[PDB]
Ligand binder design. Structure first.
Ligand code: CLA
Ligand code: CLA
Ligand code: CLA
Ligand code: CLA
Ligand SMILES: CCCCCCCCCCCCCCCC(=O)OC[C@H](CO[C@@H]1O[C@H](CS(=O)(=O)O)[C@@H](O)[C@H](O)[C@H]1O)OC(=O)CCCCCCCCCCCCCCC
Ligand SMILES: CCCCCCCCCCCCCCCC(=O)OC[C@H](COP(=O)(O)OC[C@@H](O)CO)OC(=O)CCCCCCCCCCCCCCC
Ligand SMILES: CC1=C(/C=C/C(C)=C/C=C/C(C)=C/C=C/C=C(C)/C=C/C=C(C)/C=C/C2=C(C)CCCC2(C)C)C(C)(C)CCC1
Ligand SMILES: CC1=C(/C=C/C(C)=C/C=C/C(C)=C/C=C\C=C(C)\C=C\C=C(C)\C=C\C2=C(C)CCCC2(C)C)C(C)(C)CCC1
Lengths: 56, 122
């Protein structure tokens, strides 16, 4: 069968499932953005923009 | 004149009585007479909390907060003596009343600040 590093080549002649896969990828990235924002909000101390800003 | 059933649940019970704009007069004080405050009412509209200074040690300001304990904040039915002093100044000496309310306000960032809003022994 397909080698492991070629599994996604099944999408090459499958525009619909390629769109599905792109949707899934986009979903993963946006989910990442959401969860990252949430973790930072769960850790960020907003009490001192001068000596403890976000980049610290 | 309003009854309990007119007021109940409206939030008016937590409001102090007001006077209309025509009430800009003067109430004569007789230094020979004794006086009392029959009803003192205090209705807070804003709670400010002094921010805990970063460490810059400059002027730390009072910042706005959000009331989370609802319309439970007013002091009322407070009574006490109104002394007329030798120098013509008046001194209110609080004796009793509903002269305290526990209040929780919430700071930016979520920190809750409970306080005993009071004028006890005023
Ligand atoms: C953008 C991400 C993405 C997408 C859209 C796809 C989409 C596709 N892959 Mg998959 N794949 C991915 C990533 C992705 N893959 C990765 C990272 C791997 C390596 C593990 C694989 C390995 C893989 C194989 C081996 C195969 C596919 C196949 C396929 C297709 C069928 C779906 C499948 O069988 O899933 C299988 C893939 C998974 C179930 C992903 C693994 C899940 C990981 C471990 C994360 C799960 C999230 C988890 C809840 C978070 C953990 C948190 C942690 C801190 C504990 C499909 C076209 C098949 C295909 O059609 O081949 C012909 C197929 O056989 N993929
Ligand atoms: C838009 C970005 C993009 C896209 C859509 C593709 C698409 C494709 N490439 Mg890939 N490729 C890319 C970037 C991209 N490539 C880059 C930047 C490189 C250089 C590093 C390569 C190097 C590459 C090679 C060398 C090969 C492909 C091949 C393939 C195809 C099959 C992939 C597969 O089945 O893997 C399945 C993958 C897994 C089952 C697991 C991979 C696990 C990785 C290594 C570690 C974990 C990754 C993590 C989940 C991703 C985080 C996201 C990241 C951006 C930070 C597929 C058509 C293959 C091919 O053409 O087939 C004929 C092939 O041989 N690509
Ligand atoms: C009407 C013209 C039109 C428009 C506006 C688009 C728009 C876009 N195309 Mg599409 N495309 C078109 C015609 C069009 N295409 C045609 C004629 C073809 C040939 C068949 C393709 C083939 C195609 C492919 C193969 C791919 C795209 C993808 C994308 C999207 C990438 C950006 C993205 O995902 O943002 C993020 C998304 C959002 C911020 C949400 C947008 C809200 C959507 C549009 C509302 C969904 C409801 C709607 C009624 C149903 C789908 C609408 C459809 C016309 C796109 C994007 C939505 C890619 C994609 O879909 O990635 C997932 C992709 O892989 N397009
Ligand atoms: C514009 C930026 C960008 C781009 C171009 C891509 C491109 C792609 N993403 Mg990624 N992604 C992005 C942003 C981006 N992503 C973001 C912001 C997130 C949120 C964190 C993700 C999350 C994400 C996930 C969860 C997944 C992808 C996957 C993929 C690949 C799907 C195509 C494929 O089959 O490759 C085949 C794979 C390769 C060609 C290898 C890519 C190798 C990368 C560039 C570096 C790997 C680093 C190292 C070896 C392993 C990681 C370290 C480990 C300790 C965790 C593709 C390379 C999917 C994929 O990789 O499936 C296999 C997949 O599972 N992406
Ligand atoms: C630490 C682990 C804990 C994590 C667990 C959480 C998820 C548990 C579910 C995993 C088990 C999946 C069973 C496979 C189902 C199946 O039938 O596959 C086949 C199905 C179609 O159904 C099928 O389709 C088949 C043919 S075909 O694929 O359509 O060509 C056919 O054989 C069949 O009749 C039909 O039913 O299509 C697929 O190929 C999808 C399988 C891939 C699923 C793994 C992805 C999981 C990651 C998702 C995370 C989301 C991230 C958030 C972004 C929004
Ligand atoms: C965030 C979510 C992350 C989840 C993703 C999971 C990550 C999965 C990573 C998969 C990688 C597995 C590697 C494939 C390994 C493997 O299958 O190789 C063998 C493979 C041969 O493939 P073939 O073409 O022969 O087809 C056979 C098929 O059965 C393969 O599917 O070659 C390749 O895959 C290219 C890469 C070579 C890699 C060689 C490195 C090994 C040499 C030793 C190095 C260490 C010792 C050094 C000493 C100094
Ligand atoms: C469905 C449903 C629901 C929900 C959804 C959800 C619950 C959400 C989510 C999202 C999410 C919550 C998920 C996710 C994302 C994540 C990811 C995707 C990430 C990735 C990772 C990476 C990739 C990294 C890698 C590496 C390592 C790890 C470290 C170092 C190096 C690097 C960075 C490279 C709703 C209600 C909306 C409605 C509709 C339907
Ligand atoms: C239709 C309907 C429904 C459906 C459901 C849905 C649709 C859901 C989906 C599912 C899915 C879609 C899931 C989601 C998710 C996520 C995951 C499970 C993973 C993750 C994450 C993580 C692991 C974390 C990490 C992070 C990073 C990323 C950044 C920052 C840091 C941290 C660490 C936080 C049902 C069935 C109920 C039934 C009825 C009907």
């Amino acid at each position: 069968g397909l080698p492991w590093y070629r599994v996604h080549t099944v999408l090459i002649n499958d525009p619909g499932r390629l769109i599905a896969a792109h949707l899934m990828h986009t979903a993963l990235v946006a989910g990442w953005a959401g969860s990252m924002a949430l973790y930072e909000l769960a850790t960020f101390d907003p009490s001192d923009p001068v000596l403890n800003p976000m980049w610290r | 004149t309003l009854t309990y059933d007119d007021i109940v649940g409206t939030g008016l019970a937590n409001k102090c009585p007001t006077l209309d704009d025509t009430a800009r007069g003067a109430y004569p004080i007789d230094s020979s007479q004794t006086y009392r405050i029959a009803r003192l009412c205090l209705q807070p509209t804003t709670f400010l909390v002094k921010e805990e200074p970063k460490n810059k040690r400059q002027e730390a300001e009072f910042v706005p907060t959000k009331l989370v304990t609802r319309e439970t904040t007013s002091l009322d039915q407070i009574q006490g003596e109104l002394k007329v002093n030798s120098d013509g100044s008046l001194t209110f000496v609080e004796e009793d009343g509903i002269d305290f309310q526990p209040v929780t306000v919430q700071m930016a960032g979520g920190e809750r600040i409970p306080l005993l809003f009071t004028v006890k022994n005023l």
